[PDB]
Amino acid sequence: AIGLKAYPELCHGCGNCVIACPVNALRSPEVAGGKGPTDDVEIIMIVEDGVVNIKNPDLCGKCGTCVESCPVDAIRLEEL
Amino acid sequence: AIGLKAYPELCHGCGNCVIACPVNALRSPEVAGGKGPTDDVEIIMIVEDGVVNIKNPDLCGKCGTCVESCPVDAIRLEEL
Amino acid sequence: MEYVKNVVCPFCGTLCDDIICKVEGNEIVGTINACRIGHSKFVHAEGAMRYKKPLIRKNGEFVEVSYDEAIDKAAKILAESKRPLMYGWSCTECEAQAVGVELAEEAGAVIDNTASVCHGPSVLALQDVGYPICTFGEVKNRADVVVYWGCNPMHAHPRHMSRNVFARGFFRERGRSDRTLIVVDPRKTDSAKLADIHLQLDFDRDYELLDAMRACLLGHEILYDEVAGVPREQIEEAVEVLKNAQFGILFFGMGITHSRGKHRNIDTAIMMVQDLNDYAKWTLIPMRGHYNVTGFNQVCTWESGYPYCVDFSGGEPRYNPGETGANDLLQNREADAMMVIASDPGAHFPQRALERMAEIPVIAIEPHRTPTTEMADIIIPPAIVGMEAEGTAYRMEGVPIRMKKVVDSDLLSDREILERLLEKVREYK
Amino acid sequence: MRVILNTGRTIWQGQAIESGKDLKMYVDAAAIIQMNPEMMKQLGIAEGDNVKVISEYGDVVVKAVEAKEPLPEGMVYIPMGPWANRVIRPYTDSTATPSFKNIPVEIIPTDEEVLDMPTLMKVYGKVGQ
Amino acid sequence: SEIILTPKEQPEVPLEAPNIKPDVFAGKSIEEIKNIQIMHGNEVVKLGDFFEVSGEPADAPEDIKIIIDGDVYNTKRIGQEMTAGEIIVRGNVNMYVGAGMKGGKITVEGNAGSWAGQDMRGGEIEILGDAGDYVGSSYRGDWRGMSGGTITVHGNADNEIGEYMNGGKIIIKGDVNIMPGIHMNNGLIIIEGNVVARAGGEMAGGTIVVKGMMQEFLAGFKYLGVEKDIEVDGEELPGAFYKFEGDHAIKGAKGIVYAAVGCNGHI
Amino acid sequence: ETTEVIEGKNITVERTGEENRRLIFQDCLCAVCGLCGEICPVSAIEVNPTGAMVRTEQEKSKIAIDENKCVLCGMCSSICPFQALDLQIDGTSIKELAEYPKIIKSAEIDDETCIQCKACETACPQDAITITRELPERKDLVTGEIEIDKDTCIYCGMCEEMCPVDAIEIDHQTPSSASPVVATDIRVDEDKCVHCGICKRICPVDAIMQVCRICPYGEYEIKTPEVTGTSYIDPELCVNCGWCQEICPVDAATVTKPFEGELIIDQDTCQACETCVMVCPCNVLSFPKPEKPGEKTTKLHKDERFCIYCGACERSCPVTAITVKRNRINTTPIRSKAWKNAFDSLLK
Numbered sequence A, B: 001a002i003g004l005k006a007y008p009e010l011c012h013g014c015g016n017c018v019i020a021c022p023v024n025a026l027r028s029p030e031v032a033g034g035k036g037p038t039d040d041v042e043i044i045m046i047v048e049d050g051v052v053n054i055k056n057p058d059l060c061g062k063c064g065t066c067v068e069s070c071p072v073d074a075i076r077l078e079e080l
Numbered sequence C: 001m002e003y004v005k006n007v008v009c010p011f012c013g014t015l016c017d018d019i020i021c022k023v024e025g026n027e028i029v030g031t032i033n034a035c036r037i038g039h040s041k042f043v044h045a046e047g048a049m050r051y052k053k054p055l056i057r058k059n060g061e062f063v064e065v066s067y068d069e070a071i072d073k074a075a076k077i078l079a080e081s082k083r084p085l086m087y088g089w090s091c092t093e094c095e096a097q098a099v100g101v102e103l104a105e106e107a108g109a110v111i112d113n114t115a116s117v118c119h120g121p122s123v124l125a126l127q128d129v130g131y132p133i134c135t136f137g138e139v140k141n142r143a144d145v146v147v148y149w150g151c152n153p154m155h156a157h158p159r160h161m162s163r164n165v166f167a168r169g170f171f172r173e174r175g176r177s178d179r180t181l182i183v184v185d186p187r188k189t190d191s192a193k194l195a196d197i198h199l200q201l202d203f204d205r206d207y208e209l210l211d212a213m214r215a216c217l218l219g220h221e222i223l224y225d226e227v228a229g230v231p232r233e234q235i236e237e238a239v240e241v242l243k244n245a246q247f248g249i250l251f252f253g254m255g256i257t258h259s260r261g262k263h264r265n266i267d268t269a270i271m272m273v274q275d276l277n278d279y280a281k282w283t284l285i286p287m288r289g290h291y292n293v294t295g296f297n298q299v300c301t302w303e304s305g306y307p308y309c310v311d312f313s314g315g316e317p318r319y320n321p322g323e324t325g326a327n328d329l330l331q332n333r334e335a336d337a338m339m340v341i342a343s344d345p346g347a348h349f350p351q352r353a354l355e356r357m358a359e360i361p362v363i364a365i366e367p368h369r370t371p372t373t374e375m376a377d378i379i380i381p382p383a384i385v386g387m388e389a390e391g392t393a394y395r396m397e398g399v400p401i402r403m404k405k406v407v408d409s410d411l412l413s414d415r416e417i418l419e420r421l422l423e424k425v426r427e428y429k
Numbered sequence D: 001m002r003v004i005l006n007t008g009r010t011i012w013q014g015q016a017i018e019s020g021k022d023l024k025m026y027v028d029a030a031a032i033i034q035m036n037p038e039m040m041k042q043l044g045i046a047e048g049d050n051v052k053v054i055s056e057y058g059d060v061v062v063k064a065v066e067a068k069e070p071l072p073e074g075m076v077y078i079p080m081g082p083w084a085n086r087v088i089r090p091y092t093d094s095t096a097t098p099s100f101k102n103i104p105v106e107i108i109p110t111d112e113e114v115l116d117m118p119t120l121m122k123v124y125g126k127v128g129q
Numbered sequence E: 001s002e003i004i005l006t007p008k009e010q011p012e013v014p015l016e017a018p019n020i021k022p023d024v025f026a027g028k029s030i031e032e033i034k035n036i037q038i039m040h041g042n043e044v045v046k047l048g049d050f051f052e053v054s055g056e057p058a059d060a061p062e063d064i065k066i067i068i069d070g071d072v073y074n075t076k077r078i079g080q081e082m083t084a085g086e087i088i089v090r091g092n093v094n095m096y097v098g099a100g101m102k103g104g105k106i107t108v109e110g111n112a113g114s115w116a117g118q119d120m121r122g123g124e125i126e127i128l129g130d131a132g133d134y135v136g137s138s139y140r141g142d143w144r145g146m147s148g149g150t151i152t153v154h155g156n157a158d159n160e161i162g163e164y165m166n167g168g169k170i171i172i173k174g175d176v177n178i179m180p181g182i183h184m185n186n187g188l189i190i191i192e193g194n195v196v197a198r199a200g201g202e203m204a205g206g207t208i209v210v211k212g213m214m215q216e217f218l219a220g221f222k223y224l225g226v227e228k229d230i231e232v233d234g235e236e237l238p239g240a241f242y243k244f245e246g247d248h249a250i251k252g253a254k255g256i257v258y259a260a261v262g263c264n265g266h267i
Numbered sequence F: 001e002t003t004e005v006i007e008g009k010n011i012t013v014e015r016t017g018e019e020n021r022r023l024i025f026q027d028c029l030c031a032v033c034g035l036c037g038e039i040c041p042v043s044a045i046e047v048n049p050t051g052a053m054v055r056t057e058q059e060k061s062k063i064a065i066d067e068n069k070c071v072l073c074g075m076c077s078s079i080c081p082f083q084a085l086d087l088q089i090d091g092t093s094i095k096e097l098a099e100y101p102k103i104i105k106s107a108e109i110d111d112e113t114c115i116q117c118k119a120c121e122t123a124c125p126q127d128a129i130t131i132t133r134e135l136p137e138r139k140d141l142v143t144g145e146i147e148i149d150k151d152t153c154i155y156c157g158m159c160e161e162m163c164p165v166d167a168i169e170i171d172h173q174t175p176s177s178a179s180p181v182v183a184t185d186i187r188v189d190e191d192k193c194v195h196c197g198i199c200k201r202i203c204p205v206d207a208i209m210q211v212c213r214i215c216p217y218g219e220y221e222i223k224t225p226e227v228t229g230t231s232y233i234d235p236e237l238c239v240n241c242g243w244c245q246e247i248c249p250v251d252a253a254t255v256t257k258p259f260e261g262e263l264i265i266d267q268d269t270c271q272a273c274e275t276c277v278m279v280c281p282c283n284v285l286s287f288p289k290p291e292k293p294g295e296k297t298t299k300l301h302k303d304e305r306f307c308i309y310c311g312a313c314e315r316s317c318p319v320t321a322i323t324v325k326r327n328r329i330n331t332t333p334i335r336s337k338a339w340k341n342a343f344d345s346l347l348k
Ligand SMILES: Nc1nc2c(c(=O)[nH]1)N[C@H]1C(S)=C(S)[C@@H](COP(=O)(O)OP(=O)(O)OC[C@H]3O[C@@H](n4cnc5c(=O)[nH]c(N)nc54)[C@H](O)[C@@H]3O)O[C@H]1N2
Pocket: C012, C013, C037, C118, C149, C150, C151, C152, C153, C155, C156, C157, C184, C185, C186, C187, C189, C202, C203, C204, C205, C206, C252, C253, C254, C255, C256, C259, C287, C288, C289, C290, D006, D007, D008, D009, D010, D011, D012, D013, D014, D015, D017, D080, D101, D102
């Protein structure tokens, strides 16, 4: 089925997807307000060692918001 | 000096320059009326063996009419 | 493994202060939240030269020396010099920059930072017409219209958009959905790909475009039917978007400081932002490059009265960019010695300046192997601010944040190196 | 071919400078020239082929790369670095700031090799002191 | 009357010589002129160390004419703030020639650097060769610039000549580059050659005349038509000029650009 | 120590000395009439074929000047009817020096008589004339009241469509649940409105009030149009053909010519190659199109009113079907006898 897939080799670490995602926003006010998380939180993905890193793919509702926010197609919704 | 130069290898034999030339026209009523000469005439150039052939370059006044009428630049006014 | 939080990143003028550092031994092995660039600074890339000790070259080849010998010969060069250039500063902390000002005073030197190849033109422009700015939080919480003018933050300030545009603010709780995003650039950059409006204007005609926009803004007719490659009708439609903002922010960058007109491109942009305040709240922020370029211009300004291109040769501070700037002294062959700190003009000056660097004594307070060290006579390695050394830095809009020390280094800090160089320069004089 | 030379940043050139300008990474990220695919076709070169850039002010050989950020017709992109700064315009017009962006250049295919970082600087001829 | 300065070979580190002006030379013997202080980098030195000095003293600056019989391409601020008298330079000069000038006249027989006649108040400057940027300009941050005098450049000048001009007259017989008359408030600029771009950018008042070709112009100007036989600041101009008023990016702008019809139909 | 600088197709011959002399040739102004080559006392000028230089692409300049023969006397400069040759002395052009004979010609517009109709600008074969005119604004030639009741308005768009001057503007939008309307505003631009009444008649809900005042109040509210502007004749592009004088409906333009002569055409020798027609810098020559079918026209039509007798047509014709005579060349007083022989040698 269609799911979240990361392409870290294309990623900038810019964080737009992390901030744009409503699941992340709902769970972390710092993320809702555009900051990287400092408090310990369970969210779908974060920028780690400079690139996007998927941590909780089960929480992803495949809405498509992050994909629109990435200009370099480093995060996508595709099969598997 | 600037003078008439033929490039027969590019020539179509179409006859536009021969007919367009006023010296030729004045000298041969058949040429003035668009025909190849049948009567013997002395004119600047003819189509001979399928290509343009300069016969009397001294009568050329380098007005440029022939050049305007050739689409494949097979007759020209240039140095020498 | 241990995680050090609230770290401030020492790369670009975004100056993010929410970095998590992964520390293993005494060494930084990973990061969280930092973008691709910031991460690359925090982590060592294997095969990369990190100078462990000072060096001096012997007309053609480098030999390891002690700190005292290297500092001593460097002090001798500056003491004997009649027009020394002290350039860089933007990638170290403010307390070292303050010592540099005092040392430039003592040596009769001209001190100058990377502003002279960067937002120097914005400095010249703001001195002539003004400087209407705000802090990031006003952008996040209020900004209705966000413009990136001749800057490419996705490649040059990677987290800038996520923190100021996609962020949910007090009055803009829907983040990106609450803002009209505008980008002005002759290229379809990855920043432009995210925009609601992309003015893909003709290069080096920003000044012409801004003149039409401002004439329109003040009620006048636009003379020509196309300006900078943009049709008249869309000039006015763009002016209406800006006039209808509730709160607008103009971020601008090198595309208009390096372009034809240079400081006068910034000049006209500033005056438009000012005049727009009769129709809508409007403000601007220069996208300052390094994490502490802004800090030097702050420090140099408050100690001397002038922000950069500062010449102490006469005792009094004097200021003429175009005369006393790093590139002017090198290209006009005025400088007879140069000290580089926390910068790489060998990589980033034009050929004509490097021609002069080839002929003169070059001192380089530099931790890594660079085109400048390849043109250097003395190399003095320091502890790196933000990883091994602490101190104040200033974000692109003036907000001061203290850089943190995360791990230990046996090397000396910039400030200690500079305080010793200042000690010896006095001894000789 | 006459083109307009634009220069500036890239995430890869930023990663490279903070990894190390002595590394091969930096040559791969900064010793390049970005072109629209139509322009590469017209000069007859492919990705990886080298290009000779000549200006009123210098010359450099850089590796051709297909621009993923499309350029205006007639423009090419060299990331900031010592390769770009061999050819851009040095004069500051009495502002102290060189003209790093939008410079008329001549580009030509070439079989010459890209000079690595320490070799490139030797062109300036540093004399010891 | 005549005091000769023969320059010795000029240093790579430039000289600043504000005191080379009739005002200071007045009432001094040659030996005291030999001891006048000038700057050479971060060193205070004597004029004699870089110039041989001959000639006749005089006590009033009106009667003194300084001749620099040789190239002084690396000496700045010659004639700065002079009130009277004359300076002739048989060669090139560096920056700030005649900066702050009040009266008298300077003749440069070769090229001059940037800021020739910056903050001029009166007198004359004549440059037979080329000039740099900021001819007759203001100083950084100041909105009050040149208020009087006349600058004549027989060759070409570059950028931002007459920046923030507020009186006086600049004449470039050659070509200029970009932004002539930027932020002009008052005065007169006559460019007899061409202009690359942005003549009169953000001007509020004054008059700029271009007898050659402006390659580009500015959309904030309103076209008023053509005027023939114009008279500006005591200068007679023959021929017809396209007339523009601006720069209307500025509030209340009353500046005027005249552009010669023969080469400006595209404008 | 003479010199010749070639810049593009232009030619500069200069000699230095106590008197600096320089002869400047501007290719773009040259009509290839040949007069310079004929008058040259030392045969220093060679003029390329007139037709070829006008009808075909050539890299060569229209003339060639020999440095080694040129004595820089300036006769070619004096005679040139097209201002393509200028001799300068201590750099002042000889047309301002009374020592040098000057050809007498003029072209003038009485600007008080001129009404700015612009016919002469159009007619000028050399584009030598600039005519400006400032018309009144549209708003000032028209009078009325118009206002739209936006609460009554249902935004059907019919007035915006029908408005013949696009004076009405509607702020269309796609509806949303927050803003469930198809438009948010409607406006009339009275700078454009000419009060024709169409919008009010088409309005389905009578939301537009519109009154035209032109006929009752036009005497008082509409100012009589008074159209200003000026004229300019470029003296170097100008050639004194006289087209402006003859086309002017109010005889505000006056032209005097340098040469007097005649044009002679042999219609039967002429083969209508069109060379002289294209060559003629004064638009003297034309091919009249027959007005009705079956009609015939004179093969080559002239109107010597526009003629200056430069001789370029005759020079271009390869069958010499057209010849030029020249009886009088009007000059300022000539004192040198060398100059009087050169000017008389061009008479025929
Ligand atoms: N990866 C990376 N990031 C960095 C740096 C780095 O070296 N690498 N350095 C830092 C520094 S010092 C700085 S100053 C900032 C610089 O950040 P920016 O201000 O973005 O500088 P650039 O990316 O060089 O150029 C900005 C844009 O201007 C455009 N441009 C070119 N010509 C014109 C023009 O005529 N008009 C307009 N409007 N635009 C034009 C170019 O297409 C380019 O995309 O980045 C900082 N961040």
